[PDB]
């Protein structure tokens, strides 16, 4: 209920306030040291993601089962959009942490994924993506990515998905408000809205590819992964 009553400006303030902190990583790299740094970081980011999700308007209205499902579906997309955002102002580089800013050209399989991440950062930069927009988009990923993979046909199930869709519409309203505020014409607003949401298709793609990479990493059992990360990965082979 809170979310449906919020103004555009209050939604934005709520989302800005909810933002997680930027964390740090732990001489020369090996293939092993590298991925360990990244998975250790991911694990620490995931704990902060959970607190953030609980502060996304609408999310705590959902059942614990629905919250788990949305986070299991979205978590890598959310890490990735955060990474892209942090990297916007660093052309050719990915800012994994303020003390781990990595260029493209040593982890078997990582380059294709790095390149997709760099292209998305470059796209954000070209659109001059704003912080207020970014937080709207990250909340859309949380609420959208698993919304169609709700299985039960029950009356409680649909009331659920309907609430999620009403929240999603409010976030769309919020993006449009920001664009209108910024001086965009109606035509420009609609165009920009589409441009931003089409990037989410690319973020989904990158997550799917990254998940495949992470699964092969797990089986090979040479890089240590947290119990939590192993859980989250487990959800995607299901």
């Amino acid at each position: 209920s809170l979310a449906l009553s919020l103004t555009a400006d209050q939604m934005v303030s709520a989302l800005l306030d909810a933002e997680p902190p930027i964390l740090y990583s732990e001489r020369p790299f090996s293939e092993a040291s590298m991925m360990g740094l990244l998975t250790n970081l991911a694990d620490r980011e995931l704990v902060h993601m959970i607190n953030w999700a609980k502060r996304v308007p609408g999310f705590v209205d959902l059942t614990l089962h629905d919250q788990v499902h949305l986070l299991e579906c979205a978590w890598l997309e959310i890490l990735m959009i955060g990474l892209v955002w942090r990297s916007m102002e660093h052309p050719g580089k990915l800012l994994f942490a303020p003390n781990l800013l990595l260029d493209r050209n040593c982890v078997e399989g990582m380059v294709e994924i790095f390149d997709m991440l760099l292209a998305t950062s470059s796209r954000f930069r070209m659109m001059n993506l704003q912080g207020e927009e970014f937080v709207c988009l990250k909340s859309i990923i949380l609420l959208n990515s698993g919304v169609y993979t709700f299985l039960s046909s029950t009356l409680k199930s649909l009331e659920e998905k309907d609430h999620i869709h009403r929240v999603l519409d409010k976030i769309t309203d919020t993006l449009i408000h920001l664009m209108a505020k910024a001086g965009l014409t109606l035509q420009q607003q609609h165009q920009r809205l589409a441009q931003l949401l089409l990037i989410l298709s690319h973020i989904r793609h990158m997550s799917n590819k990254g998940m495949e990479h992470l699964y092969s990493m797990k089986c090979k059992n040479v890089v240590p992964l947290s119990d939590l990360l192993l859980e989250m990965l487990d959800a995607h082979r299901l």
Binding site: V47, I50, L64, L71, E72, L228, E231, M232
Partner: peptide
């Protein structure tokens, strides 16, 4: 399944 459950409640 379970760790995420606990984190959400906590």
């Amino acid at each position: 399944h379970k760790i995420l459950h606990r984190l959400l409640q906590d």
